[PDB]
Design a protein around this ligand. Structure first.
Ligand SMILES: [Ca+2]
Ligand SMILES: [Ca+2]
Ligand SMILES: [Ca+2]
Ligand SMILES: [Ca+2]
Ligand SMILES: [Ca+2]
Ligand SMILES: [Ca+2]
Ligand SMILES: [Ca+2]
Ligand SMILES: [Cl-]
Length: 206
């Protein structure tokens, strides 16, 4: 009696599952060959595997039980089983959760407040802002801008540096309530968030 064996590509390489996959969704179908043409029955082995993947006994279709996330867990290995009526064969399948852009940039220590004198020289960096993004590639890289734009302050798109660009005057304007806007470079469906930045201006002699 000749034992059964798997054939699918994802026993040598890896199986990709995009993290947006609704639960109850089929992820693949396990395919095996018995040389003696036995009606094979498939299963899922382990408890790590079994709380993620349910396997249709006969068809070898594999579907998703608990939802996926790459922010939590990027990759993990799972072991599947196929029966010969007398003997179980199992094989190691490296899963890899495929990323999507489901995280808008997240600020740290907002709101923001700065205090500078009217005489602050033009080009003086006065604050630095930081927004993180955990996503993959352009989903997880940030670009800072003002919103609306400002005439008196700029912000470095790369490093999030708030510099002075037009000279200030206390007798004209004693405060400036700006909104820093952080955005990710995912060209198809991008995300963006806002932080308040309240620059108070201090009087001097003129
Ligand atoms: Ca056999
Ligand atoms: Ca996610
Ligand atoms: Ca993601
Ligand atoms: Ca993102
Ligand atoms: Ca990042
Ligand atoms: Ca003045
Ligand atoms: Ca003054
Ligand atoms: Cl805020």
């Amino acid at each position: 009696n000749r034992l059964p064996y798997f054939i699918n590509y994802f026993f040598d390489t890896y199986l990709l599952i995009n993290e947006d996959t609704p639960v109850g969704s089929s992820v693949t179908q396990l395919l095996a060959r018995d040389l003696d043409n036995d009606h094979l029955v498939f299963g899922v082995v382990g408890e790590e595997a079994s709380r993620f993947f349910a396997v249709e006994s006969v068809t070898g279709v594999v579907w998703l039980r608990q939802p996926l996330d790459r922010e939590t867990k990027s990759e993990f290995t799972v072991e599947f089983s196929v029966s010969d009526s007398q003997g179980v064969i199992k094989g190691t399948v490296n899963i890899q959760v495929g990323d999507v852009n489901d995280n808008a940039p997240r600020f740290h220590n907002q709101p923001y407040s700065v205090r500078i004198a009217e005489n602050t020289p033009v080009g003086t960096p006065i604050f630095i802002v930081n927004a993180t993004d955990p996503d993959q590639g352009a989903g997880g890289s940030v670009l800072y801008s003002f919103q609306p734009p400002s005439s008196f302050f700029a912000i470095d798109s790369g490093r999030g540096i708030v510099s002075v660009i037009r000279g200030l005057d206390y007798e004209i304007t004693q405060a400036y309530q700006l909104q820093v806007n952080a955005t990710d470079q995912d060209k198809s469906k991008p995300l963006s968030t806002l932080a308040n930045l309240a620059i108070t201006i201090t009087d001097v002699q003129d």
